[PDB]
Each structure stands twice: as structure tokens, then as C-alpha cells.
Design an enzyme around this catalytic site. Sequence first.
Site, PDB file in Angstrom:
ATOM      1  N   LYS A   7       0.846  -1.206   0.000  1.00 27.49           N
ATOM      2  CA  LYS A   7       0.000   0.000   0.000  1.00 27.49           C
ATOM      3  C   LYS A   7       0.882   1.256   0.000  1.00 27.49           C
ATOM      4  O   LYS A   7       0.622   2.201  -0.749  1.00 27.49           O
ATOM      5  CB  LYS A   7      -1.020  -0.019   1.135  1.00 27.49           C
ATOM      6  N   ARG A  10       2.198   1.686  -3.537  1.00 26.92           N
ATOM      7  CA  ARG A  10       1.165   2.186  -4.489  1.00 26.92           C
ATOM      8  C   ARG A  10       0.879   3.675  -4.235  1.00 26.92           C
ATOM      9  O   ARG A  10       0.751   4.491  -5.154  1.00 26.92           O
ATOM     10  CB  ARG A  10      -0.116   1.348  -4.335  1.00 26.92           C
ATOM     11  N   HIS A  12       2.757   6.007  -2.617  1.00 35.53           N
ATOM     12  CA  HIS A  12       3.830   7.005  -2.387  1.00 35.53           C
ATOM     13  C   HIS A  12       5.080   6.836  -3.242  1.00 35.53           C
ATOM     14  O   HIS A  12       5.899   7.746  -3.178  1.00 35.53           O
ATOM     15  CB  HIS A  12       4.215   6.995  -0.893  1.00 35.53           C
ATOM     16  N   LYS A  41      -8.787  12.077  -2.511  1.00 32.05           N
ATOM     17  CA  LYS A  41      -7.820  12.200  -1.393  1.00 32.05           C
ATOM     18  C   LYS A  41      -7.242  13.606  -1.443  1.00 32.05           C
ATOM     19  O   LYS A  41      -6.705  13.968  -2.472  1.00 32.05           O
ATOM     20  CB  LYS A  41      -6.707  11.170  -1.511  1.00 32.05           C
ATOM     21  N   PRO A  42      -7.368  14.454  -0.404  1.00 32.94           N
ATOM     22  CA  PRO A  42      -7.025  15.877  -0.536  1.00 32.94           C
ATOM     23  C   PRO A  42      -5.540  16.221  -0.743  1.00 32.94           C
ATOM     24  O   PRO A  42      -5.242  17.161  -1.496  1.00 32.94           O
ATOM     25  CB  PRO A  42      -7.535  16.489   0.782  1.00 32.94           C
ATOM     26  N   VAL A  43      -4.621  15.514  -0.074  1.00 33.60           N
ATOM     27  CA  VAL A  43      -3.152  15.723  -0.269  1.00 33.60           C
ATOM     28  C   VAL A  43      -2.423  14.377  -0.240  1.00 33.60           C
ATOM     29  O   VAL A  43      -2.752  13.522   0.587  1.00 33.60           O
ATOM     30  CB  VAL A  43      -2.544  16.696   0.759  1.00 33.60           C
ATOM     31  N   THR A  45       1.787  12.640  -1.294  1.00 35.86           N
ATOM     32  CA  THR A  45       3.145  12.838  -1.830  1.00 35.86           C
ATOM     33  C   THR A  45       3.657  11.591  -2.533  1.00 35.86           C
ATOM     34  O   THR A  45       3.535  10.499  -1.950  1.00 35.86           O
ATOM     35  CB  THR A  45       4.065  13.275  -0.689  1.00 35.86           C
ATOM     36  N   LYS A  66       3.945  12.392  13.833  1.00 35.39           N
ATOM     37  CA  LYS A  66       2.853  13.353  14.121  1.00 35.39           C
ATOM     38  C   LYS A  66       1.850  12.773  15.112  1.00 35.39           C
ATOM     39  O   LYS A  66       1.325  13.547  15.909  1.00 35.39           O
ATOM     40  CB  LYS A  66       2.176  13.823  12.849  1.00 35.39           C
ATOM     41  N   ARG A  85      -2.129  18.320  -4.479  1.00 35.78           N
ATOM     42  CA  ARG A  85      -3.003  19.139  -3.608  1.00 35.78           C
ATOM     43  C   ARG A  85      -4.309  19.417  -4.352  1.00 35.78           C
ATOM     44  O   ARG A  85      -4.245  19.947  -5.473  1.00 35.78           O
ATOM     45  CB  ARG A  85      -2.299  20.454  -3.246  1.00 35.78           C
ATOM     46  N   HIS A 119       3.927   4.213   6.028  1.00 33.59           N
ATOM     47  CA  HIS A 119       3.171   5.500   6.151  1.00 33.59           C
ATOM     48  C   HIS A 119       4.079   6.689   5.843  1.00 33.59           C
ATOM     49  O   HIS A 119       5.220   6.684   6.283  1.00 33.59           O
ATOM     50  CB  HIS A 119       2.586   5.648   7.562  1.00 33.59           C
ATOM     51  N   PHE A 120       3.592   7.642   5.049  1.00 32.75           N
ATOM     52  CA  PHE A 120       4.310   8.893   4.713  1.00 32.75           C
ATOM     53  C   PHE A 120       3.856   9.931   5.725  1.00 32.75           C
ATOM     54  O   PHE A 120       2.672  10.291   5.755  1.00 32.75           O
ATOM     55  CB  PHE A 120       4.053   9.334   3.275  1.00 32.75           C
ATOM     56  N   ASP A 121       4.731  10.384   6.623  1.00 33.81           N
ATOM     57  CA  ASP A 121       4.312  11.331   7.673  1.00 33.81           C
ATOM     58  C   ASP A 121       4.442  12.802   7.252  1.00 33.81           C
ATOM     59  O   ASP A 121       3.619  13.577   7.690  1.00 33.81           O
ATOM     60  CB  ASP A 121       5.116  11.058   8.962  1.00 33.81           C
TER      61      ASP A 121
END
Length: 124
Positions: A7, A10, A12, A41-43, A45, A66, A85, A119-121
Site C-alpha cells: 500500500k 502504491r 507514495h 484524497k485531498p493531499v 506525496t 505526528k 493538492r 506511512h508517509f508522515d
Amino acid sequence: KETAAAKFERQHMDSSTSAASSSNYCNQMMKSRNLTKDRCKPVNTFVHESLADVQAVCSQKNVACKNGQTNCYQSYSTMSITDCRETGSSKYPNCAYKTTQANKHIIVACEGNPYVPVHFDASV
Ligand SMILES: [Rh+]
Ligand SMILES: [Rh+]
């Protein structure tokens, strides 16, 4: 039963371009990577480095996540990334994004054996 590791790849990873291909990139990639299926999805990377170089961040600079967990890691080198964005006029299911290129240090959360990004923080 997509794996957490898969995941992250896919959502990031995009090693096949050095930088934000074009002004169209996020419109294409947010759709093709299935980040506009249930909602826009709003944002999000994308990272333009090899999988080996992103996986290696899990043994680099340990930093607070975070969400207050301890399993986040900051890249020692800057990486080529694209931030996507949602435009204020984007209306599901016709999700529209601004494509912006940057060179920043990435922060990822890592889990498992093997210990890999899930996870992309942030970027900083
Ligand atoms: Rh996540
Ligand atoms: Rh998640």
C-alpha cells in the site's frame, strides 16, 4: 489483503520519473494509483527515488511521528518528491490537483520484519 508495505509503494513511490513529469502528473497519478476511488484524497506525496533508497530511511534519523508514536525516520539526504493538492474547484468524481515538485527530507513510519515503510508522515 494488500500488504501495508505494498500500500505504501502504491500510494507514495514513483521511481520511474526524476520529478513531477508535467502539470498533468497529479491528475493522472492520483487516479491511476486509486487515491480517487471512494473520495478525492485531498493531499498525497510521491517520491522519485529508488525503492532501496526509500526503504533505507527506516535505519536513518529516528524522529517522533505526528501521532506521537516513535517509529518515524527522517532521510539524511534530500529526495525528489511531488506534492499533490486538491484544487478548491475539484468535485468528486472529477478529482483535480495542482502538481508541485520539491527536494526535501522525507519522514516515514516503518513497521514489520522486514522493517519497511508503511506511512508517509511529512516532508521538511
Ligand atoms: Rh498512514
Ligand atoms: Rh494509513
